[PDB]
Amino acid sequence: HQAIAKMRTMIEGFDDISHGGLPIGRSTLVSGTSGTGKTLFSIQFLYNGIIEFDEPGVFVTFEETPQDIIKNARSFGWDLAKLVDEGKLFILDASLSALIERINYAIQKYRARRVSIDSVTSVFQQYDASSVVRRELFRLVARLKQIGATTVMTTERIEEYGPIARYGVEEFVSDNVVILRNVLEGERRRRTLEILKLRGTSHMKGEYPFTITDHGINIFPL
Amino acid sequence: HQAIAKMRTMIEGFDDISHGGLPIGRSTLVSGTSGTGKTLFSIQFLYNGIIEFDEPGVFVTFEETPQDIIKNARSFGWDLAKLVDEGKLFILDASLSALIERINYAIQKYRARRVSIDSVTSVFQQYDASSVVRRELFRLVARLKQIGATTVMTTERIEEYGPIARYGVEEFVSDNVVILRNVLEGERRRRTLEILKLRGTSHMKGEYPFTITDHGINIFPL
Amino acid sequence: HQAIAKMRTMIEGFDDISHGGLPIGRSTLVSGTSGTGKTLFSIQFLYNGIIEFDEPGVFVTFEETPQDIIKNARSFGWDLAKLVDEGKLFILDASLSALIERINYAIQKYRARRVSIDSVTSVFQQYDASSVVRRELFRLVARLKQIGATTVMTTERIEEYGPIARYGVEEFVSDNVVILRNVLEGERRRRTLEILKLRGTSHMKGEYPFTITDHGINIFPL
Amino acid sequence: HQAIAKMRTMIEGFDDISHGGLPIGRSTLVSGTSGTGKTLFSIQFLYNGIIEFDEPGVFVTFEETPQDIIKNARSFGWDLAKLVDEGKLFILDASLSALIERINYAIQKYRARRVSIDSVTSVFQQYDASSVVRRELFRLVARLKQIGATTVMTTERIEEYGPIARYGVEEFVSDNVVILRNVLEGERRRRTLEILKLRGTSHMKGEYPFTITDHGINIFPL
Amino acid sequence: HQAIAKMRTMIEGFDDISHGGLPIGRSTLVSGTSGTGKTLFSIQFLYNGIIEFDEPGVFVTFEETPQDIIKNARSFGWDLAKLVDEGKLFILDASLSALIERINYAIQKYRARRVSIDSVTSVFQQYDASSVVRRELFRLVARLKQIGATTVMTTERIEEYGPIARYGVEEFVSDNVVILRNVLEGERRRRTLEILKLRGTSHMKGEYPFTITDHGINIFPL
Amino acid sequence: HQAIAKMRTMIEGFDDISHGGLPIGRSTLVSGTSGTGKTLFSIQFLYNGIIEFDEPGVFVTFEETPQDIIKNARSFGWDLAKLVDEGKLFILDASLSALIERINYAIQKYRARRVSIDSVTSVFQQYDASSVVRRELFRLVARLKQIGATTVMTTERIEEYGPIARYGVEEFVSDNVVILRNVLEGERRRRTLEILKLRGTSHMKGEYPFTITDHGINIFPL
Ligand SMILES: Nc1ncnc2c1ncn2[C@@H]1O[C@H](COP(=O)(O)OP(=O)(O)OP(=O)(O)O)[C@@H](O)[C@H]1O
Ligand SMILES: Nc1ncnc2c1ncn2[C@@H]1O[C@H](COP(=O)(O)OP(=O)(O)OP(=O)(O)O)[C@@H](O)[C@H]1O
Ligand SMILES: Nc1ncnc2c1ncn2[C@@H]1O[C@H](COP(=O)(O)OP(=O)(O)OP(=O)(O)O)[C@@H](O)[C@H]1O
Ligand SMILES: Nc1ncnc2c1ncn2[C@@H]1O[C@H](COP(=O)(O)OP(=O)(O)OP(=O)(O)O)[C@@H](O)[C@H]1O
Ligand SMILES: Nc1ncnc2c1ncn2[C@@H]1O[C@H](COP(=O)(O)OP(=O)(O)OP(=O)(O)O)[C@@H](O)[C@H]1O
Ligand SMILES: Nc1ncnc2c1ncn2[C@@H]1O[C@H](COP(=O)(O)OP(=O)(O)OP(=O)(O)O)[C@@H](O)[C@H]1O
Ligand SMILES: [Mg+2]
Ligand SMILES: [Mg+2]
Ligand SMILES: [Mg+2]
Ligand SMILES: [Mg+2]
Ligand SMILES: [Mg+2]
Ligand SMILES: [Mg+2]
Secondary structure (H helix, E strand, C coil), X not given: CCCXXXXXXXXXXXHHHHCCCEECCCEEEEEECCCCCHHHHHHHHHHHHHHHHCCCEEEEEXXXXXXXXXXXXXXXXCCHHHHHHHCCEEEEECCCHHHHHHHHHHHHHHCCCCEEECCCHHHHCCCCCHHHHHHHHHHHHHHHHHHCCCEEEEEECCCCCCCCCXXXXXXXXXXXXXXXXXXXXXCEEEEEEEEEEECCCCCCCCEEEEEEEXXXXXXXXX | CCCCCEECCCCECHHHHHCCXXXXXXXXXXXXXXXXXXXXXXXXXXHXXXXXXXXXXXXXXXXXCHHHHHHHHHCCCCCXXXXXXXXXXXXXXXXXXXXXXXXHHHHHHHCCCCEEECCCHHHHCCCCCXXXXXXXXXXXXXXXXXXXXXXXXXXXXXXXXXXXXCCCCHHHCCCEEEEEEEEEECCEEEEEEEEEEECCCCCCCCEEEEEEECCEEEECCC | CCCCCEECCCCECHHHHHCCCEECCCXXXXXXXXXXXXXXXXXXXXXXXXXXXXXXXXXXXXXXXXXXXXXXXXXXCCCHHHHHHHCCEEEEECCCHHHHHHHHHHHHHHCCCCEEECCCHHHHCCCCCHHHHHHHHXXXXXXXXXXXXXXXXXXXXXXXXXXXXXXXXXXXXXXXXXXXXEEEECCEEEEEEEEEEECCCCCCCCEEEEEEECCEEEECCC | XXXXXXXXXXCECHHHHHCCCEECCCEEEEXXXXXXXXXXXXHHHHHHHHHHHCCCEEEEECCCCHHHHHHHHHCCCCCHHHHHHHCCEEEEECCXXXXXXXXXXXXXXXXXXXXXXXXCHHHHCCCCCHHHHHHHHHHHHHHHHHHCCCEEEEEECCCCCCCCCCCCCHHHCXXXXXXXXXXXXXXXXXXXXXXXXXXXXXXXXXXXXXEEECCEEEECCC | CXXXXXXXXXXXXXXXXXXXXXXXXXXXXXXXXXXXCHHHHHHHHHHHHHHHHCCCEEEEECCCCHHHHHHHHHHXXXXXXXXXXXXXXXXXXXXXXHHHHHHHHHHHHXXXXXXXXXXXXXXXXXXXXXXXXXXXXXXXXXXXXXXXXXXXXXEECCCCCCCCCCCCCHHHCXXXXXXXXXXXXXXXXXXXXXXXXXXXXXXXXXXXXXXXXXXXXXXXXX | CCCCCEXXXXXXXXXXXXXXXXXXXXXXXXXXXXXXXXXXXXXXXXXXXXXXXCCCEEEEECCCCHHHXXXXXXCCCCCHHHHHHHCCEEEEECCCHHHHHHHHHHHHHHCCCCEEECCCHHXXXXXXXXXXXXXXXXXXXXHHHHHCCCEEEEEECCCCCCCCCCCCXXXXXXXXXXXXXXXXEXXXXXEEEEEEEECCCCCCCCXXXXXXXXXXXXXXXX
């Protein structure tokens, strides 16, 4: 009566609203506007995995250099430089088949099953039509599932209440969709987290407030 | 005073609001946003048919592999692998004339009159103009009606309250239209099912709540 | 002080709100979203004419086969097969000059003055620009007026409260415009009928509810 | 302190809200959706002029034949056929320089200073860019002013509360702009008339109700 | 603590809300929909300057002939023909480098430092991209500032509450922006004047009502 | 637990809501509509730096000449001419690699670590696609970070509540985003300042009123 296994992301409150955490072997799409916490979410997923379960991670980035990410993480107190030196964490700088080959090579070398992709929207900006975007996204998700590494891919969206992704096709390809919203009402911004869908497993429905503190993302499972 | 015959879908509450179930020999278009339950609807239609009436089914999929669908079904407790091995269910992996020929060949081989199409939107993404989309959709619906197999085709739409399909032409070709809506109000999502039209037979008018539980879709015929 | 003659459509309540029925020799444009009753309106116009005034009719269809229309009509109790066999009704299957020639040939052969066109939108989908759409629509309307047969042409529109037709030019060519709206409010759908204009004769202003029952369209002239 | 002369249109109530009627020698743009009364306005202007001041008129039409206009006018009791036979009224059927030459020739032949243009939007549909539309409209208005005949040109607009014309450039070329609106509120339509501007003379500001009765347009100058 | 000099426009109430009038040597962009008073504003600026300070002016027009402008001005009681004959006012008929050369030649010949441009939108209609529009507008503004003549350039906008100009780039090039709005509420139109910005000097913030009377524009500095 | 250093902008109240001021070595994007205070913000940043910390600055401008900026600054009482003569301030007139080379040359020559860019939107207007805009913006930001000079780049946006930049990609490239809004409500304009994000450091959330007085921008840290 159950055939889905989940690995805990160890993010405070996210496992409660995801009913066990992120499913193992499936690629999640985390979408939100600028300043919501996509990069922080993808960094904290890998960092918590490495700290708790001793499971290494690979963080592929396109819009940032590794040093900037390390400084932003040390802002929270996470010494990612020590993890990179010890080999428990890998950071890949690519700034599509070659990217998948490099990710697979890193996964095999570091014996890591956890992947975070900071910006696939920047990669898809090169392509023109949304059909090609869907094809490339499906190819990447299929390769990630074949490898067997749980992946958190973050994409950018324009409007707080509108299409889940700018192209509008990301929501219909990824197995799991998580949405971060920075809603501006009454001249004040509020952060909300929503689990749009989880193919093959139950999850909470609605939006729940969360705060980006000095220790990382903290979701309130009200 | 009546010349329309209907086969029960055995979905809890859907037959009550459809006034006898899905008409026999006509192709339905089930449209909704991501995470509403189109794939689950198409899977449950075939599974309930096979279990109750011993009527085999063919499930043609484009955006997923058969193994993923089997795992997602086993999440509900449906052992689709046993049905596939016994021959009471067929799953087709195509990832347009060749597709119709393959569907007809499967129908003839398995002596099955029930077809589910998980994503024709992905197929239509290749075409550019909406006129070509209408032509291909009409060709597929005509072939399905000529074969005589009741079909449930699922398409993707962007906005909860907007065009029935992304191209806007699907609603005017399919004989029957069913709409699943995932409405986000008050930072909470609500699932609703609507029967937009049934060419040649009566149906309930409006939208009715439904829930995706661990046993499948359950519609409340209030 | 009057130079306009009208033939009664015999639709329950439509003659009351049209102040005498559809004008003779002019082509009406019946526009509405999917599931509103355009095809049923065009079928009932011809059927009521044949039954009451013994005036034969021609029903030209593009998106459907004659057999499907006959079955949908028999759902209401209308034995259109008997009328077709007796010659009192003709059904034309075209699935633009050749179409007009065929319609004129059918009109001359069957001595019928009543024409219904189920989908000119599908024909206009081939053309690209709205100017060509306007030119073709004007040509068809002029030919219909020259023939002298009262015509009911049905077109498709996307939004309940928006452009009268998808191209936006149909309203400015046809002499008479009738609008069927399927308004979704409070998670319930309501059917309304409106007479946008009647060139050269008075009509009621506003929208009136109507219901599609088992006997056909029934408008309430409140 | 005044250098503008006005000719009364004799339309009931329009002269009161226009403060003396339509200015002499300037071309008006009457814009409204379908079924508002543009064609009736242009016909009644010429008919009232001919009846009262014995000043002949020229009515150039593109979307209709003269016979249809004559029948629609006789619906109100206006025997335009007698006026055409007597030479007090001319009707031109053109279905851009040649059009202006023909209008000037008719004006010279019939010694008439009053012109109505039923559809310049249909003519402008041939052109692609709005700059060409503006150029052609300015050329026509300049030619009409050089001839010295008061002109009422009617154009089509899509939305009740939106751009004054479909192209959006008509309002900035014509000296005078009149807007007819058919507002649908509470499932009921209401007719309103507005004078957007009169270059060089004062006018009432706002919108006033008007009714199309069996005698013609009747505006209430509240 | 101050390095900006202003010349009074002598328009009733505009100097109060502009805190000293239009800055000397800078080009203003006056934007509004049709019928708001852009042409009247540009005419009254020059006329008041000539009458009060004996400072001649140049009025360059594109959408109108000089005679029409003279008649519209005489509607208010302004005998612009006498001023043109005396040489205290020049009217230029151009219906982009040649235009600037002609304006400079007129400025040098008539020893005038005041320029009004009635329609640069019509000139920019020839260009396709908004980048070229920005380049040409910047070139014209730079030439006007180099000449040293205070200029009032009027542009056309479509929506009452939307982009300041149709192209959306005029607001970011001109040093000073004034907006005239004709707001339609409650079936009544209200005229409002706003000073969007004044580069290098203070101004009132908000919108103030104004009326176009028989003596010209009159702003209420509430 | 902290690896981010900040240099105070000395703007009244901005350091309080930014929690220490602008981060050192990162490029900020200040976005707002016309008349909000982007140019004044970029000028005041450099001027306050030079006055307080004796840290020279470079102001690169595209839409204005240096003399106009000097006059607008002297409107506030800032004698930028004296600073330019003394060498404590440099103003660059460029009216993309050559621009970066010139900025680096100025930085090296004047031993200044502070840069303000008045209009990169005008530069990006030359490019067509938003992908090229993103690439050029990322290149410029990377070069600025490599140089090590704190930069304030100002971009233009159309709608008060809409995309952060006109292209919609600026918000996802710059490390820090500040938004100035000129909200028109009740026929009155209100100025608000918001810090959308600060990569790697905390900041206040919401919008706070600010006023452009005769001494410069003054933000109220309520
Ligand atoms: N130490 C911290 N304390 C609090 N908030 C922090 C801290 N460090 C970073 N942030 C938050 O990080 C946010 C922006 O950084 P983040 O990495 O989340 O960006 P993002 O949403 O992924 O951006 P993008 O869309 O450009 O990829 C800011 O809103 C800020 O509040
Ligand atoms: N065992 C389960 N219990 C409850 N809900 C489940 C279960 N398995 C799946 N779901 C539901 O399935 C939904 C998504 O899966 P589903 O197959 O319905 O997608 P879909 O709407 O067809 O997607 P797409 O638009 O990508 O084709 C989630 O919202 C989740 O709630
Ligand atoms: N026997 C019946 N009793 C009640 N309603 C019926 C019956 N037969 C058909 N209908 C109605 O017919 C509607 C759809 O069929 P119809 O022929 O009116 O479509 P349509 O609006 O012309 O479609 P399209 O836009 O695709 O041309 C349904 O909403 C259904 O309620
Ligand atoms: N005798 C009449 N009594 C009342 N109303 C009439 C009469 N004759 C015509 N009408 C009115 O004429 C209107 C449509 O005809 P009209 O000539 O005004 O069209 P229009 O607005 O110019 O159309 P288009 O946009 O297609 O050019 C209808 O709304 C109808 O009410
Ligand atoms: N003597 C007058 N008394 C009152 N109002 C007048 C008078 N003369 C002209 N007007 C006003 O002039 C307005 C239109 O003329 P105006 O020159 O202001 O047009 P505009 O806004 O510049 O037009 P466009 O956008 O076509 O350039 C009308 O709304 C009218 O009220
Ligand atoms: N001395 C001053 N006192 C008050 N406000 C001033 C003063 N000088 C300039 N301003 C303000 O400057 C604003 C416009 O100048 P500013 O340099 O801020 O433009 P901006 O927003 O950068 O423009 P753009 O979008 O064209 O680049 C006006 O709204 C005005 O109120
Ligand atoms: Mg980020
Ligand atoms: Mg699915
Ligand atoms: Mg139909
Ligand atoms: Mg008309
Ligand atoms: Mg004007
Ligand atoms: Mg500025």
